[PDB]
Enzyme design. Structure first.
Site, PDB file in Angstrom:
ATOM      1  N   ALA A  68       1.022  -1.569   0.113  1.00 47.78           N
ATOM      2  CA  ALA A  68       0.078  -0.045   0.051  1.00 47.78           C
ATOM      3  C   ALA A  68       0.924   1.185  -0.029  1.00 47.78           C
ATOM      4  O   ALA A  68       0.564   2.100  -0.700  1.00 47.78           O
ATOM      5  CB  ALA A  68      -0.955   0.169   1.227  1.00 47.78           C
ATOM      6  N   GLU A 143      24.344  -4.101 -13.688  1.00 48.75           N
ATOM      7  CA  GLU A 143      25.684  -3.666 -13.738  1.00 48.75           C
ATOM      8  C   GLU A 143      26.537  -5.077 -13.467  1.00 48.75           C
ATOM      9  O   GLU A 143      26.875  -5.075 -12.170  1.00 48.75           O
ATOM     10  CB  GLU A 143      25.941  -2.768 -12.710  1.00 48.75           C
ATOM     11  CG  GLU A 143      25.058  -1.281 -12.975  1.00 48.75           C
ATOM     12  CD  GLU A 143      25.223  -0.189 -12.075  1.00 48.75           C
ATOM     13  OE1 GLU A 143      26.049  -0.276 -11.314  1.00 48.75           O
ATOM     14  OE2 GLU A 143      24.132   0.634 -12.005  1.00 48.75           O
ATOM     15  N   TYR A 144      26.909  -5.886 -14.290  1.00 51.80           N
ATOM     16  CA  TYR A 144      26.455  -5.695 -16.099  1.00 51.80           C
ATOM     17  C   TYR A 144      26.533  -7.285 -16.462  1.00 51.80           C
ATOM     18  O   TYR A 144      27.226  -7.967 -15.842  1.00 51.80           O
ATOM     19  CB  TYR A 144      27.666  -4.980 -16.610  1.00 51.80           C
ATOM     20  CG  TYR A 144      27.721  -3.719 -16.200  1.00 51.80           C
ATOM     21  CD1 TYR A 144      27.023  -2.600 -16.836  1.00 51.80           C
ATOM     22  CD2 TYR A 144      28.775  -3.261 -15.493  1.00 51.80           C
ATOM     23  CE1 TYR A 144      27.296  -1.277 -16.428  1.00 51.80           C
ATOM     24  CE2 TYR A 144      28.827  -1.947 -14.738  1.00 51.80           C
ATOM     25  CZ  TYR A 144      28.193  -1.099 -15.348  1.00 51.80           C
ATOM     26  OH  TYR A 144      28.501   0.295 -14.843  1.00 51.80           O
ATOM     27  N   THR A 212      28.261   8.137 -17.269  1.00 56.02           N
ATOM     28  CA  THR A 212      29.391   8.728 -17.565  1.00 56.02           C
ATOM     29  C   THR A 212      29.541   9.350 -16.256  1.00 56.02           C
ATOM     30  O   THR A 212      29.671  10.783 -16.049  1.00 56.02           O
ATOM     31  CB  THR A 212      29.371   9.494 -18.685  1.00 56.02           C
ATOM     32  OG1 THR A 212      27.877  10.010 -19.067  1.00 56.02           O
ATOM     33  CG2 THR A 212      29.453   8.712 -19.884  1.00 56.02           C
ATOM     34  N   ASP A 214      31.070   8.345 -11.869  1.00 55.83           N
ATOM     35  CA  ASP A 214      32.015   7.364 -11.178  1.00 55.83           C
ATOM     36  C   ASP A 214      33.152   6.791 -11.971  1.00 55.83           C
ATOM     37  O   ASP A 214      33.525   5.540 -11.728  1.00 55.83           O
ATOM     38  CB  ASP A 214      30.986   6.197 -10.919  1.00 55.83           C
ATOM     39  CG  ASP A 214      29.916   6.398  -9.860  1.00 55.83           C
ATOM     40  OD1 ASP A 214      30.073   7.522  -8.929  1.00 55.83           O
ATOM     41  OD2 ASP A 214      28.961   5.677  -9.514  1.00 55.83           O
ATOM     42  N   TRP A 402      21.766  10.958 -11.701  1.00 59.86           N
ATOM     43  CA  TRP A 402      21.702  10.328 -10.309  1.00 59.86           C
ATOM     44  C   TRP A 402      21.734  11.361  -9.417  1.00 59.86           C
ATOM     45  O   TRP A 402      23.113  11.711  -9.479  1.00 59.86           O
ATOM     46  CB  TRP A 402      22.455   9.221 -10.229  1.00 59.86           C
ATOM     47  CG  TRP A 402      22.525   8.430  -8.664  1.00 59.86           C
ATOM     48  CD1 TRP A 402      23.150   8.835  -7.713  1.00 59.86           C
ATOM     49  CD2 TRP A 402      21.554   7.412  -8.419  1.00 59.86           C
ATOM     50  NE1 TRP A 402      22.591   7.867  -6.710  1.00 59.86           N
ATOM     51  CE2 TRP A 402      21.789   6.920  -7.008  1.00 59.86           C
ATOM     52  CE3 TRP A 402      20.462   6.825  -9.325  1.00 59.86           C
ATOM     53  CZ2 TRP A 402      20.857   6.155  -6.416  1.00 59.86           C
ATOM     54  CZ3 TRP A 402      19.777   5.661  -8.460  1.00 59.86           C
ATOM     55  CH2 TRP A 402      19.864   5.484  -7.060  1.00 59.86           C
TER      56      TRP A 402
HETATM   57  C1  LIG Z   1      21.473   4.588 -12.255  1.00 55.54           C
HETATM   58  N1  LIG Z   1      22.551   3.685 -11.787  1.00 55.54           N
HETATM   59  C2  LIG Z   1      23.710   4.270 -11.525  1.00 55.54           C
HETATM   60  O1  LIG Z   1      24.027   5.355 -11.342  1.00 55.54           O
HETATM   61  N2  LIG Z   1      24.622   3.197 -10.995  1.00 55.54           N
HETATM   62  C3  LIG Z   1      25.881   3.474 -10.516  1.00 55.54           C
HETATM   63  N3  LIG Z   1      26.367   4.609 -10.329  1.00 55.54           N
HETATM   64  N4  LIG Z   1      26.583   2.267 -10.283  1.00 55.54           N
HETATM   65  C4  LIG Z   1      27.968   2.384  -9.681  1.00 55.54           C
HETATM   66  C5  LIG Z   1      27.854   1.999  -8.545  1.00 55.54           C
HETATM   67  C6  LIG Z   1      29.221   2.008  -7.464  1.00 55.54           C
HETATM   68  C7  LIG Z   1      28.947   2.654  -6.324  1.00 55.54           C
HETATM   69  N5  LIG Z   1      28.525   3.976  -6.569  1.00 55.54           N
HETATM   70  C8  LIG Z   1      27.744   4.889  -5.464  1.00 55.54           C
HETATM   71  O2  LIG Z   1      27.867   4.651  -4.606  1.00 55.54           O
HETATM   72  C9  LIG Z   1      27.451   6.190  -6.171  1.00 55.54           C
HETATM   73  N6  LIG Z   1      26.581   6.694  -5.097  1.00 55.54           N
HETATM   74  N7  LIG Z   1      26.093   7.777  -5.234  1.00 55.54           N
HETATM   75  N8  LIG Z   1      25.662   8.861  -5.303  1.00 55.54           N
HETATM   76  C10 LIG Z   1      30.480   2.675  -5.351  1.00 55.54           C
HETATM   77  O3  LIG Z   1      30.925   3.649  -5.254  1.00 55.54           O
HETATM   78  N9  LIG Z   1      30.593   1.363  -4.632  1.00 55.54           N
HETATM   79  C11 LIG Z   1      29.768   0.298  -4.889  1.00 55.54           C
HETATM   80  C12 LIG Z   1      28.796   0.223  -3.767  1.00 55.54           C
HETATM   81  C13 LIG Z   1      27.851   1.305  -3.596  1.00 55.54           C
HETATM   82  C14 LIG Z   1      26.991   1.157  -2.608  1.00 55.54           C
HETATM   83  C15 LIG Z   1      26.760   0.104  -1.734  1.00 55.54           C
HETATM   84  C16 LIG Z   1      27.482  -1.069  -1.839  1.00 55.54           C
HETATM   85  C17 LIG Z   1      28.633  -0.920  -3.027  1.00 55.54           C
HETATM   86  C18 LIG Z   1      31.682   1.580  -3.981  1.00 55.54           C
HETATM   87  C19 LIG Z   1      31.891   2.688  -2.971  1.00 55.54           C
HETATM   88  C20 LIG Z   1      33.053   3.530  -2.865  1.00 55.54           C
HETATM   89  C21 LIG Z   1      32.837   4.193  -1.812  1.00 55.54           C
HETATM   90  C22 LIG Z   1      31.617   5.038  -1.508  1.00 55.54           C
HETATM   91  C23 LIG Z   1      30.512   4.260  -1.797  1.00 55.54           C
HETATM   92  C24 LIG Z   1      30.592   3.278  -2.566  1.00 55.54           C
END
Ligand SMILES: CNC(=O)NC(=N)NCCC[C@H](NC(=O)C[N-][N+]#N)C(=O)N(Cc1ccccc1)Cc1ccccc1
Length: 497
Positions: A68, A143-144, A212, A214, A402
C-alpha cells in the site's frame, strides 16, 4: 526541433517507503512533494528506483516492501503528470546493490535472461508490474551482463520491447508510447563486456543512458575527476579494453578505433558508442552526477588532483570517522565519501576550509581542502554548460542524472539543464569547449566526410595514399597497391563521400 530528454532518478529505499512521510526529512529526506510543478515541467522522465528480479525470476519489489505504501508513493509521482503531458514515470530494475557480480540478487539476473521460457516469464512480469503500478516504461540497470549472458540480455530486451508495443496499442498510447531504456556502462572496462553487440543492445531501446560518472573513486590509486568531459594530459590514463573485444577487426581497424592508453572521460564513452555501426546518436543519453566523490589523505601542488590518497574503498564505510568537514548528510548516511551537490554548496558557503577550483581542460569543478588534504570531484551548473553544448553538437538524445534528491532545494542543477536545452534567451554559440583531449577513435559508425581523387585501375599507390571509390575514401595500409579498394586487405576505409 526534438526536445532533449532530461531523465532524473528518484531513488527511495524500502525503509523510507515503509515509513513514507512528506513532513519529516529525518525519515524521508526527499519526498515526492519536493518535486514541484516547476521541476516536473523540467523533467522528461523520472526513473523510480529500484525494483529487483526475485528467485522466481520475475521483476518484483523488494519483498519487505509495504505494498500500500509503495502504491501511494508511485501514485504521487504519476500525479505529477498533470503538470507535464510529456512526462514519464519509468521504473528501474537492478542497480549496483542488487545486480553487481557479487550482488544479493545477481544469479536471478543471469537466470532470468538465460532461456526462451525464462525470458518470456521475466518480460511478462516487467510489463505486468508496469501496468499494475501505473508506470510509463521500463529501465534496466543491470551492472553488468558478462559477455556470455549478453545474447540472453539482448533477447530479453527484444521481448520486453514487443510486449511494451502491444501495451501501447492496447492502451491507445501512441501520443506517449511505453518506453524501454537501460543504464549503460560509461567506461571502457565494463562497456567491453557487451561492446561487440552494442547495436543489438540499443535497437530495442528508446535510449541508452550512459553512466558517465563514477569514473574515479577510492578503488583507483590516484585521485581524478569522476566525470571529466575531455581529458587532461596531466591526469592518469587507462588501458583501452575495447581493443580486446571480440569484434573480428584488423590491427589497423582496432588501432584506429581504440587508442591506448586513453583518458577516461565522458567524451570517450560517447565516442566509443558512436563508433559502432547502427548505434544512433539520438538514442545516446549522457549521464551526469548530482553528487561529488570525496577523497582524504591527498597531497598538494595541483589542488589535490592526481594525488595518492588514503580513502577507504570498503563497503560499508569501515569506521565512524566522518572526515568530510561540514558534510552533515555524510554523518546521516555514515559515509564521508559521497556528498550531494546540495551539501557541497553548503560546505563551500560555510567556514569549512574548501576552495572551489576549476579544471579548464576537463571543464569540471573540484573542491580542495588544503589544511586536511581533501579533494572532491563533482559537477555544477558551469560544467553542465559544456556538457549540454556537447549534447547538442553531437546530437545526443539528452541527459540523465543520479539523483533528484541531490539537487539543491531550489533545483538549480535541473533548472540549468533545462535552460541550456530550452531557454530561448540562452546562447552558448560562443562557449569555448577548450583544448582538453578529445577521444580520437574512428570506427565504422562514425566515419568522417572526406574527399580524395578517384581510384584509377593500374595506378601503383604508395603507403598512405587516399582515393575515393564506391562511396568511400580509402587509404593504403602499405605500398605499392594496385587492387581495387575494398577488394582485399590492403585498403583501409577511412572516410565517406
Ligand atoms: C542509475 N545507476 C547508477 O547510477 N549506477 C551506478 N552509479 N553504479 C556504480 C555503483 C558504484 C557505487 N556508486 C555509488 O555508491 C554512487 N553513489 N552515489 N551517489 C560505489 O561507489 N561503490 C559500490 C557500492 C555502492 C553502494 C553500496 C555497495 C557498493 C563503491 C563505493 C565506494 C565509496 C563510497 C560508496 C561506494
Amino acid at each position: 526541433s526534438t526536445r532533449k530528454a532530461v531523465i532524473g532518478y528518484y531513488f527511495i529505499p524500502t525503509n523510507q517507503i515503509n515509513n513514507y512521510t512528506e513532513t519529516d526529512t529525518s525519515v524521508v529526506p526527499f519526498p515526492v512533494s519536493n518535486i514541484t510543478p516547476a521541476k516536473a515541467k523540467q523533467l522528461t522522465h523520472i526513473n523510480f528506483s529500484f525494483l529487483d528480479i526475485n528467485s522466481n525470476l520475475e521483476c518484483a519489489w523488494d519483498p519487505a516492501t509495504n505494498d500500500a505504501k509503495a502504491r501511494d508513493v508511485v501514485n504521487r509521482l504519476t500525479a505529477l503528470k498533470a503538470h507535464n503531458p510529456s512526462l514519464r514515470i519509468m521504473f528501474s530494475i537492478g542497480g549496483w546493490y542488487y545486480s553487481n557480480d557479487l550482488g544479493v540478487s545477481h544469479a536471478n539476473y543471469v537466470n532470468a535472461v538465460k532461456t526462451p521460457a525464462a525470458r518470456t516469464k521475466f518480460a511478462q512480469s516487467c510489463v505486468r508490474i508496469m501496468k499494475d503500478y501505473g508506470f510509463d516504461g521500463v529501465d534496466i540497470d543491470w551492472e553488468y551482463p558478462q559477455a556470455a549472458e549478453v545474447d540472453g540480455f539482448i533477447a530479453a530486451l527484444q521481448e520486453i520491447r514487443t510486449l511494451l508495443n502491444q501495451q501501447t496499442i492496447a492502451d491507445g498510447r501512441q501520443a506517449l508510447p511505453y518506453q524501454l531504456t537501460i543504464a549503460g556502462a560509461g567506461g571502457a572496462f565494463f562497456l567491453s563486456r557487451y561492446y561487440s553487440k552494442l547495436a543489438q543492445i540499443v535497437a530495442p531501446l528508446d535510449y541508452i543512458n550512459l553512466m558517465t560518472y563514477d569514473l574515479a573513486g577510492p578503488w583507483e590509486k590516484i585521485t581524478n575527476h569522476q566525470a571529466a568531459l575531455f581529458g587532461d594530459a596531466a591526469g592518469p590514463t587507462f588501458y583501452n579494453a575495447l581493443r580486446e573485444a571480440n569484434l573480428g577487426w584488423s590491427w589497423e581497424e582496432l588501432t584506429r578505433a581504440f587508442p591506448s592508453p586513453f583518458s577516461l572521460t565522458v567524451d570517450a564513452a560517447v565516442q566509443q558508442h558512436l563508433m559502432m555501426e547502427g548505434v544512433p546518436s539520438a538514442k545516446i543519453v549522457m549521464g551526469v552526477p548530482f553528487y561529488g566523490r570525496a577523497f582524504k589523505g591527498v597531497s598538494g601542488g595541483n589542488g589535490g588532483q592526481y594525488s595518492s590518497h588514503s580513502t577507504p574503498g570498503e563497503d560499508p564505510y569501515p569506521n565512524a570517522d566522518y572526515w568530510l568537514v561540514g558534510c552533515d548528510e555524510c554523518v546521516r548516511d555514515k559515509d564521508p565519501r559521497i556528498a550531494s551537490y546540495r551539501q557541497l554548496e553548503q560546505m563551500l558557503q560555510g567556514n569549512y576550509g574548501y576552495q572551489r577550483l576549476w579544471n579548464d581542460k576537463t571543464k569540471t569543478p573540484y573542491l580542495y581542502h588544503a589544511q586536511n588534504g581533501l579533494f572532491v570531484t563533482y559537477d555544477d551548473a558551469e560544467s553542465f554548460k559544456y556538457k549540454a553544448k556537447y549534447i547538442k553538437q553531437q546530437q545526443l538524445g539528452g541527459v540523465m542524472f543520479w539523483h533528484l534528491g541531490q539537487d539543491n532545494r531550489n533545483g538549480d542543477l535541473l533548472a540549468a539543464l533545462d535552460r541550456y536545452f530550452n531557454a530561448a534567451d540562452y546562447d552558448d554559440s560562443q562557449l569555448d569547449m577548450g583544448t582538453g583531449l578529445r577521444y580520437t577513435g574512428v570506427g565504422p559508425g562514425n566515419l568522417p566526410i572526406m574527399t580524395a581523387p578517384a581510384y584509377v585501375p593500374g595506378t601503383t599507390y604508395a603507403q598512405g595514399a587516399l582515393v575515393s571509390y564506391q562511396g568511400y575514401v580509402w587509404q593504403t595500409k602499405w605500398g605499392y597497391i594496385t587492387s581495387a579498394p575494398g577488394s582485399d586487405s590492403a585498403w583501409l576505409k577511412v572516410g565517406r563521400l
